[PDB]
From Swiss-Prot, chain A:
Residue window of the full protein shown: 361 to 1227 of 1227
Protein name, UniProt field: Multifunctional 2-oxoglutarate metabolism enzyme
Mutant lacking the gene: phenotype: Cells lacking this gene do not show any ODH activity, in contrast to wild-type, demonstrating that this protein is part of a functional ODH complex in mycobacteria.
Enzyme Commission no: 2.2.1.5, 4.1.1.71, 1.2.4.2, 2.3.1.61
Residues annotated for acetyl-CoA binding in this entry: 666, 682, 717, 720, 770, 777-778
UniProt-reported outcome of changing residue 648 to A: Loss of KG decarboxylase activity
Organism of derivation: Mycolicibacterium smegmatis (strain ATCC 700084 / mc(2)155) (Mycobacterium smegmatis)
Gene Ontology biological-process entries: tricarboxylic acid cycle
Length: 855, 847
């Protein structure tokens, strides 16, 4: 036969090999630190021969030049893992082509960005040699790359770019991308902060955020750009950024629940190479990318891959070939780019935005670069990486290299390049001198943020009977032909009955609170594991057609007024992924993104919220004091000793009470459905942006004593302290009381049952519903109504080192000494775990507490 | 031409055939003239010429029937070829005896579940019904490991089929499982606070049914927190491999202890610890030679559908990042499940890397046996109601093939059921005894009386001299050489600093024959450039570890000891879990994990809460892991200041952990030596210094190492050795850590003979007797203050403010706090604000 047919088969194999694996041979590293193949008779003598390619006939040397330029030069493209052939074709069409050369104006603009990037760092090195700044030197190309992402987003007519990033080049991005004034950055290095800057306890300069407007230089558009605050904990901000962006998209009616699919707010997420591979929150957050409750239409990721993590080499940081391999699980294309090629970096940035816009999905840019100085500017890296730093010492920086290229191209002269550098440096010097001339402020200890936010003087949470009845009737306003599951129908009928006749249970009180807020025009977002039905089969926020699987959400009917006009409200209820860290981070971010939303996250059991401990510690409990960032997220934590074991008993009340300070959070453990209703309505209507932690029930959901009357919803308010109904409404005599039992939560019902069984008129039980801030005035005023009390006990089912005792045992005798001197504890013994593993052992221990309280 | 269509068609089946494979038991979701034409293909024994008809039948059987194979993401062509050779050829047909054995495992699997359903209808058991093939699959993994002559299989798994695996794979007695359902436990079963039945572990010996080998099989305990045990399993296996001299640090590369890790579908996709643990798989400090993963993929997670649980096509897509092949297999085909299990073991043995089996199955009952799944999944449960189980279908096949008769099949099933009934009746006949409250485990482990931790001068000198015993031609970095010279000087002359005291402790243990494993972020050099446990040749990059020289006696014989020091990945959850597991796996090892700053250990909160602080009380599982947490107010911000002492003190109970904040290098040395030599297996939490590493006052004398012991309470040297008068003291300041040096400097500056400073070095268990004895030496004290740099809601005050007046009322009634105000964060963000607040504490203490 004709050997051209054999040779053509080898050409088809070569095309596939470059597309699939060319990235493994690409010249992406700026440091350059690192017989049985069947050729089917193809050799170097076939270079000028024409071959058939899939339609077209091309010379072998031309096929090989296109493949080598696309896949083996300064850009490594990974895309053949993508399922969708139209996405692979889209990328092939754009990378297997001769690129348009940037104009001289575009080249000068890129150089102006590299000048700003390096000169900002060398200026800080000269003025503040002894202060950490986490310089981007060796990775200056991140600045024209980020400029190109934002400029391309503006070109697509998008609304906003929200950035989250770590420390590397943070100050550089704040000054040269977001527009944080140089004077403000210099004031931080000077330690001369005005009262606004010195507010709260604060945080380090490389954790701060900023906002501004980016104005295009090559087009007629502009776009908002924001950079969010973050703690030191690397990658922890990743789900927070997604939540912030989702909330902004929902507000613009763009995105998943929106009237259009523009997803017009773009998350731009930066990462370090060691952190991106090592932190589990990265995979958890990528896992949210296509979920209906969390999708943001694609995140643009940039890894500042300086091939080091402090003193650790990549071989000790990851098991994958690339630090970006984790992102392939959601079908993201990956572009590995040589950080010493500014034009390739800008081109990849624009291609990434175009791909995100075309397919509304994630894209990753792996920018290979290096770290010019030590990990921080006081660290000596040659002790552990002598070879790498001997190579770095021989390298001209990307600014100098690009300047020489433009001089060589004839664009600029050496004198012009020198003058432009002196001008930028001269402007930094001028601003530095002005800041240094400012009057020095006296340094004072930091102050509590407690008084910065206060409840309005007038706020009622009660609703009328018509509102209760409307929410009850919504449960039976089924779509025509809908088949209700036979074991769900009694719940719907019971809700109509409770709305008109009382005995309202916990689950319905929660829906009365959320439904009445929706009717008043509020956006309510509720999510968590199995939250649509409820872990305890109690919520039924979504009901499923038994014959068709169609879904009906009764509370969504409250988003329309009886006359047919919208209230402006909405109910967004989702089953979350099986994640705690990313889910809690996302809801925290969502509440920051839309302060007017009611945002609730529900743990399956409170025992699993320790999986989100970094979010609780670094964002929820402390973001207001550290950054002035406000969140109104609600965490619902099912809690209570019921004999189900040490991981189905406790939400670790003691840990939240320990974290509490400065009125940063509200912490509550309501004992009645109406009090929970009023708590949620107060939180949604008070205009205070502070988190709420609620310890919620499990067996108490179906306790026939734990029900509320209609008048408790229509004629009452949130009560931080509750007395027994016999004293406030009944014929109970407070003067007969000699023993006071103080408690919180479901144990009240067991104590009250024991009091009734033994007719103990000498014992009274007082509940603390709001654990933090402690209701000092209401507690003192309640205790003053029992003048003959000789002894007081704090009673709890939790072990002695858990529950409220560790904080209350110390604080109650200090803040109210005339009431709580001599306060004693009644509880389970101190325990390493939250409870026994045995239901029978739980029952004996529970009875001991009750016997001790009445002994 | 037509051959061009064939080569691309072969690639299409290999790359994407899995997308069309018949893997779901529920089924809820160029020309025809070329068939007899011969084409050239790359056969497994050389180039072959095959009819297109035969190429297509092989590809459809390999990739589109009950097994979906994902492997073309793997970099190594030899691994793809290995898989092709085994999937694109005829599979070995099981013998009739092997088929009957698989059926006996399905019988045991289903009959155990239906028996518990009959006897204990109201108790959760997380049944494997709908996924019974996991039992012959696990049997096949373990049998294939025994066929390779491996030493042990260690299993970690969640709740799904846990009781079934304990009884039918590991050999936990049926009588013990029934006693758990009965709630009639003997005193050993009732020991500690305990845990739920589907969290418990067991160990036994597996004996091959057809071969001549045995193998050890163990299943580790775990909390409810799904996937949290994954890094613990890897640590336990690595410790066992290091002991057998197999694996990464071993003389052979057998990696002869196999991790077998089971997962649920929703948890495997959702929990970040999965990716963190996979990321450890090829790292020198953590590699275990490949984990075999089995996902029990029942296409549901409680009430949540897969479309709400993950963004990837498969729940296993995360594992592709470490190049693991993935085998998706139809759970209703027991022979395909066993065949994939054996293939996975063979692949793990050939390439010493991870393999994933995604077993597609269903969940016969609700999430738990009291839950109604048709409320949320009506369609799925209408389909499940029409399905014959895998046991019934496999029995019908064997009866149909003529392997067994219906009478033989029923007799075998009734024999197993009769034996369950007999054991159940025997357990039910036992008298029920009084149920008592659970008891503290504190007294279970006690320190031997007068444990000596001092070493002689020769030992100190040997460790100092080891720092300059450089290999021939080694070039020391010019800024590292002064540290080595200073260590030799300190070993002979004193003024021993914190960093060298740590290495004196570890070095002296290695010399005594102990394995010491030390790891953490940048731990080889040290975050504060203080450790230099490994030094790097300035010219060649070669590494030298001075403490490794202590593993050889001066006469040249080995001590039996070793120093394993690693830079960890940038992980806290998987790294802490791994070190906890390692300490469980080798109780004789000294295992230390170091946080870069203590502020980041909250990333491992699930491991601290669920394993470290509570595993002894819950499961009787003992760990001696050490956590080193750099801590101290130095003006570096709220994430570079605190290891959250207050949280560890709150978690503390029952003597479960030792918690310490030493103020001197010798006291830290004695703390580490006591921990390594006391024969007690309980974790140690140490709050370690940063600036105090280089404080010239924070140095120790040679006599502090050779003639002393760990001191839980320390007085000022002026009273124990100097000319200080204790009777002049009217104000006592109690403290812990570096603030002691600032308080002592202020006392010396103002000649405050009326003030004494007492340090509590061991925070938990509180040294009640030594504290009382010390305070009794100051008879004229009129006021006592607890002084700390931490905010009032942090540090030791929240626990000590409550416990000291209760446990020592004649000494601490009236105890007052001196500290920073209560704060939402651990500190101010400003170094200047920190400095003003620090001076306020010092001024208040002496005001
Ligand atoms: C381990 C670690 C760093 C190395 C990161 O390497 P890579 O991701 O490649 O980024 P790059 O630095 O190469 O660009 S910087 C950071 C630290 O905390 C600085 C960051 C910060 O505090 O904000 P440090 O004070 O310990 O140095 N640090 C401690 C650390 C540990 N664990 C977590 C979860 N977060 C952290 N901040
Ligand atoms: C969300 C959740 C479960 C669903 C798992 O689905 P999948 O991974 O597909 O497994 P399978 O059940 O389909 O086989 S079972 C488990 C729970 O905790 C039971 C497990 C246990 O407690 O040990 P529960 O009491 O809330 O039901 N539970 C709560 C839970 C939440 N978050 C974590 C980290 N761990 C958990 N145990
Ligand atoms: Mg890096
Ligand atoms: Mg509010
Ligand atoms: Mg499942
Ligand atoms: Mg020990």
């Amino acid at each position: 036969g004709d050997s051209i047919e054999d040779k053509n088969a080898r050409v088809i194999e070569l095309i596939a090999a470059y597309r699939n694996r060319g990235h493994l041979m690409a010249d992406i590293d700026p440091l350059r630190l690192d017989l049985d193949v069947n050729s089917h008779g193809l050799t170097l003598w076939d270079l000028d021969r024409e071959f058939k390619v899939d339609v077209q006939r091309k010379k072998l040397r031309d096929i090989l030049s296109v493949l080598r330029d696309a896949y083996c030069r300064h850009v490594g493209v990974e895309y053949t893992h993508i399922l969708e052939p139209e996405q692979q074709r889209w990328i092939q069409e754009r990378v297997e082509t001769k690129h348009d050369k940037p104009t001289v104006a575009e080249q000068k603009y890129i150089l102006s960005k590299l000048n700003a990037a390096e000169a900002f760092e060398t200026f800080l090195q000269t003025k503040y040699v002894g202060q950490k700044r986490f310089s981007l030197e060796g990775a200056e190309t991140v600045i024209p790359m980020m400029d190109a992402v934002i400029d391309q987003c503006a070109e697509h007519g998008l609304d906003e770019v929200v950035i989250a990033m770590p420390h590397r080049g943070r100050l550089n991005v704040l000054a040269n991308i977001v527009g944080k004034p140089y004077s403000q950055i210099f004031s931080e290095f000077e330690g001369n902060l005005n009262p606004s800057q010195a507010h709260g306890s604060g945080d380090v300069k490389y954790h701060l955020g900023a906002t501004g407007t980016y104005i295009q230089m090559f087009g007629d558009n502009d776009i908002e750009v924001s950079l969010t605050a973050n703690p030191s904990h690397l990658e922890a901000v990743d789900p927070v950024l997604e939540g912030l962006v989702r909330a902004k998209q929902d507000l613009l009616d763009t995105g998943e629940e929106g009237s259009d699919n523009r997803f017009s707010v773009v998350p731009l997420m930066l990462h370090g190479d060691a952190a991106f591979a090592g932190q589990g929150v990265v995979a958890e957050t990528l896992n949210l990318a296509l979920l209906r409750g969390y999708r943001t239409g694609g995140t643009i990721h940039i890894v500042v891959n300086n091939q080091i993590g402090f003193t650790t080499a990549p071989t000790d940081s990851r098991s994958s070939e690339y630090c970006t391999d984790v992102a392939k699980m959601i079908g993201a294309p990956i572009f590995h780019v040589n950080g010493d090629d500014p034009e390739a970096c800008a081109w990849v940035a624009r291609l990434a935005v175009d791909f995100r816009q075309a397919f509304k999905k994630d894209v990753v840019i792996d920018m290979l670069c290096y770290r010019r100085r030590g990990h921080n500017e006081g660290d000596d890296p040659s002790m552990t990486q002598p070879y790498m730093y001997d190579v770095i010492d021989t390298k001209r920086g990307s600014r100098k290299a690009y300047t020489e290229a433009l001089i060589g191209r004839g664009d600029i002269s050496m004198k012009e390049a020198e003058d432009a550098l002196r001008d930028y440096q001269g402007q930094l010097e001028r601003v530095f001198n002005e800041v240094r001339e400012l009057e020095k402020h006296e340094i004072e200890p930091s102050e509590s943020v407690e008084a910065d936010q206060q409840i309005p003087s007038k706020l009622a949470t009660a609703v009328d009977k018509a509102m209760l009845q409307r929410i009850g009737d919504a449960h039976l306003a089924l779509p025509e032909g809908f088949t209700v599951h036979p074991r769900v129908r009694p719940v719907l009928e019971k809700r109509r009955e409770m709305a008109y006749e009382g005995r309202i249970d916990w689950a319905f009180a929660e829906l009365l609170a959320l439904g009445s807020l929706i009717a008043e025009g509020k956006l309510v977002r509720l999510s968590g594991q199995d939250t649509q039905r409820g872990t305890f089969t109690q919520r039924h926020a979504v009901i499923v057609d038994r014959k068709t699987g169609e879904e009906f959400t009764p509370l969504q009917l409250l988003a329309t007024n009886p006359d047919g006009t919208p209230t402006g409200g909405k109910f967004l209820v989702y089953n979350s992924a099986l994640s705690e860290f990313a889910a809690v981070g996302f809801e925290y971010g969502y509440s920051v993104g839309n302060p007017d939303a009611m945002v609730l996250w529900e743990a399956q059991f409170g025992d699993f919220v320790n999986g989100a401990q970094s979010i609780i510690d670094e964002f929820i409990s402390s973001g207001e004091a550290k950054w002035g960032q406000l969140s109104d997220v609600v965490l619902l934590l099912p809690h209570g000793h019921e004999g189900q074991g040490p991981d189905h008993t406790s939400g670790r009340i003691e840990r939240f009470l320990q974290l509490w300070a400065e009125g940063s959070m509200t912490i509550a453990m309501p004992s009645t459905p109406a009090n929970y209703f009023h708590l949620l309505r107060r939180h949604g209507k008070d205009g205070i942006q502070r988190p709420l932690i609620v310890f919620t029930p499990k067996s108490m959901l179906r306790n026939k004593a734990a029900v509320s009357d209609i008048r408790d919803f229509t004629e009452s308010k949130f009560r931080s302290v509750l007395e027994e109904p016999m004293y406030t409404d009944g014929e109970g005599d407070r003067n007969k009381v000699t023993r006071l039992l103080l408690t919180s939560g479901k144990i009240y019902y067991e104590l009250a049952a024991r009091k009734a069984k033994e007719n103990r008129e000498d014992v009274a039980i007082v509940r603390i519903e709001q654990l933090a801030p402690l209701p000092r005035r209401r507690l003192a005023e309640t205790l003053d109504r029992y003048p003959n009390v000789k002894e007081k006990f704090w009673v709890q089912e939790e072990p002695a080192n858990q529950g409220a005792w560790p904080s209350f045992g110390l604080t109650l005798p200090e803040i109210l000494p005339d009431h709580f001197t001599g306060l004693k504890r009644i509880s389970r013994r101190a325990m390493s775990a939250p409870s026994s593993g045995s239901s029978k052992v739980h029952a004996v221990e529970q009875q001991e507490i009750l016997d001790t309280a009445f002994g």
